[PDB]
Amino acid sequence: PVKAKCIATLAPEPLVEHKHRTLILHLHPDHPTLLTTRSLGSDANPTRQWIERPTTVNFTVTGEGLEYTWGNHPPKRVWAQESGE
Amino acid sequence: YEHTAVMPNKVGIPYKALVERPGYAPVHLQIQLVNTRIIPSTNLEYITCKYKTKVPSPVVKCCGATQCTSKPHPDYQCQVFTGVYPFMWGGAYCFCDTENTQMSEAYVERSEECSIDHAKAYKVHTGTVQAMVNITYGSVSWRSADVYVNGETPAKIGDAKLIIGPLSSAWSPFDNKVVVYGHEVYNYDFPEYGTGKAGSFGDLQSRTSTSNDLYANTNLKLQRPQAGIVHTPFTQAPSGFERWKRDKGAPLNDVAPFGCSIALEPLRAENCAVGSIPISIDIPDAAFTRISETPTVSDLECKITECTYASDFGGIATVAYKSSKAGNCPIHSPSGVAVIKENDVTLAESGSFTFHFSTANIHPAFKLQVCTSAVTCKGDCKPPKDHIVDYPAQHTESFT
Amino acid sequence: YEHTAVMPNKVGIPYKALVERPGYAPVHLQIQLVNTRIIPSTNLEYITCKYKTKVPSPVVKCCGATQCTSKPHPDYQCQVFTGVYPFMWGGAYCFCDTENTQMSEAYVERSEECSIDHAKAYKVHTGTVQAMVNITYGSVSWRSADVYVNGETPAKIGDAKLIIGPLSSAWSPFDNKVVVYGHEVYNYDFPEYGTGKAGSFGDLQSRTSTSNDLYANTNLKLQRPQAGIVHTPFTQAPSGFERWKRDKGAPLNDVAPFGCSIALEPLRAENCAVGSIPISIDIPDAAFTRISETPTVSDLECKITECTYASDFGGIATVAYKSSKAGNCPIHSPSGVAVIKENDVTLAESGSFTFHFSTANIHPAFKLQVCTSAVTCKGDCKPPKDHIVDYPAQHTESFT
Secondary structure (H helix, E strand, C coil): CCCCCCCCCCCCCCCCCCCCCCEEECCCCCEEEEEEEEECCCCCCCEEEEEECCCEEEEEECCEEEEEEECCCCCCCEEECCCCC | CCCCEECCCCCCCCCCCEECCCCCCCCCCCCEECCCCCCCCCCCEEECCEECCCCCCEEEEEECCCCCCCCCCCCCCCEEEEEECECCCCCCCCCEEEEEECEECCCCECCCHHHCEEEEEEEEECCCCEEEECCCCCCCCEEEEEECCCCCCCCCCCCCCCCCCCCCCCCCCCCCCEEEEEEEECCCCCHHHHHHCCCCCEEEECCCCCCCCEECCCEEECCCCCEEEECEEEEEECCCCCCCCCCCCCCCCHCCCCCCEEEECCEEEECHHHHHCEEEECHHHHHHEEECCCCCCCEEEEEEEECCCCCCCCCEEEEECCCCCCEEEEECCCCCCCCCCEEEECCCCCCCCEEEEEEECCCCCCCCCCCCCCEECCCCCCCCCCCCCCCCCCCCCCCC | CCCEEECCCCCCCCCCEEECCCEEEEEEEEEEEECCCCCCCCCCEEEEEEEEECCCCEEEEEECCCCCCCCCCCCCCCEEECCCCCCCCCCCCCCCCCEEEEEEEECCCEHHHHHCCCCEEEEEECHHHHHCCCCCCHHHCCEEECCCCCCCCCCCCCEEEECCCCCCCCCCCCCCEEEEEECEEEEECCCCCCCCCCCCCCCCCECCCCCEEEEEECCCCCCCCCCCCCCEEEEEECCCCCCCCCCCCHHHHHHHCCCCCCCCCCCEEEEECCCCCEEEEEEEHCCEEEHCCHHHCCCCEEEEEECCCCCCCCCCEEEEECCCCCCCEECCCCCCCCCEECCCECCCCCCCCEEEEECCCCCCECCCCCCCCCCCCCCEEEECCCCCCCCCCCCCCCCC
């Protein structure tokens, strides 16, 4: 057994949607995709869920940031400061 | 002029402080902590992996017993058995019918995947954090050097000597006990070398890959082969490395706090944005410009024109520059309210040049130090609309 | 019958506990913690050693200047010099008299002794302590196995399964920061890699021996050669490795507390006698003798005859054994007052056999459990005269 880099997986890109300190994400994979995040406060408040059924989800993003992992697609990151004026 | 500065630990954004040396012209900083890779002190305690019941081929004495001995193989399970009639290619071959004896033996051994696909425990201490700090300094305009955090280490790469930390935010996102797998790192209370219950994680526990000795609590129990046929019932828990790959927990690069990323590399935890770092630099005095050569800018005026109450450098402000000479003029807001994109502004003889910035208070009353000339750029700002992209440049939220 | 037992951490003396399994004959222990080697978690931070100013041979331009550059050698000190007239084997050779230029350059380099005779810093964490525990068990009479302390590790070497610790006495005699030299280990606050003041310890600071990069604050200052002659004044502090060998501090194997010895070996601290260890064993039930086969000894009598109020097993006591069968009979004082040399006593049909012991209370009122028969061996003891030899077997001092 060797450390080959398999030609490997990739899940379709997400639909990013803005709200006030909140990411609505209409999402639509090919296969069951383990999504997960890390609210970068010292309060981690992570989430995990395999997604195979297309699902609009939500994420209470904080002031300092959140990150977002659409499958083995690379991890995203997001500034959600205010939007409530 | 050894410019001490408390400094927030946050990776992807410069920290353009200002050198207020009494006597010569000030110089801006641009300190971008491009990385916060950690590399705690650790110890390889034991690799684990899934077993392989690589059965040695059983003995079959045809008429009478064959006592087994406890060979020193890891988890060397061996049990004599009688009452067989072993069908092997010619029907049976041993002519007795109860004195037909069969001695099954099986030991546990590292898989071939153990070398390569293997979890890996650690006792993790704190160690010492690092960074490839870029400073596009002053007029030097470049140094991208790897540094430390311990508050007496310089790194004379470029021309400047810089001392960092120790940081106050000692949260090692790694726990004391950690399991590691390929790239997914698990802050797991692995039981220990030498103990792991069969089926549970660490049923196989080898110190390293080379280590011929190990601990194999697999509950390997041989049973007698059936109805006078040659084979080896090995009844065994599939590994706690088999599970731990599909009934596991989530990775620390997906559950950590305070903003870290991970690698199976020196076991760093990159970019952990938390707390502050007391950083202090000894600039090369040659890089300074004497005060009598930069234009004096006073008798000026500053005002916002479209302040954006935001993260991206949306805040702007014209400045009625009132110079004496003409040239460059480093700029900074000593108040942390306003973070400015421009370190330096060019000046003709008393012109005007807008800069960009970002704030967090509706009424930004921040001083602006245009190369030894302070000014309040008071005003009012507007909220944006479009907030779903990576991390800010503002990082200055307070009471507003 | 998994015989839990709190147990004092002390190296060179057995701890002959007694297995009181309800139903079968009891069995004695003999647990001698032959070693307490520690091996904390550590990190090689930097080797240091004495420098060698391995001067590269200076340039001598005969008429005009030779500007030097800052080569990347460690502590690359280089200074141009003019005003020479270098006598080299023919009187001078450069025909000018002030335009004669001499460029001296010198860098710091690891000595050849740095590979072999070198101090060695460490950031020292706690790690995990070990022992080659002999048990000359029961009638097994032997196992000398290497074990751990973490309170779920077995070590099935011999036939018994034994779980040790974790000990309560977490005094790592090593401090956090340690320097190490050959065999003498110094719990020294070494300054750090990258910082050490010249002359002070760690003027040279190499990560390892192979590491071509280092930190050499030696205050190496070249001076101009004298009176038109070829040579290289290098003015330098002799190393903080030169001192630290004759103005040092004393070694931790000569200044530690709570009784430790040291090695430049896995960095253990052997035989640290301090506190207790909650030890628990799972005996092989086969090693047990059933209760109906050992003689019942009751209707006996015990008395001292010459009790020595001492450390060596000077205390003695005849016992009017009143047996039923004849054979062996394991013995122990469940009270820690008396420590007994004999684990087992042979018995004819109700004879008498003295044993040896040691106590600490003038009136030793200790029970003696002669294979399920208790008895008070009350009496009085005598002080000895001759107290200058190694360590005791008594280790039971209390209020007396």
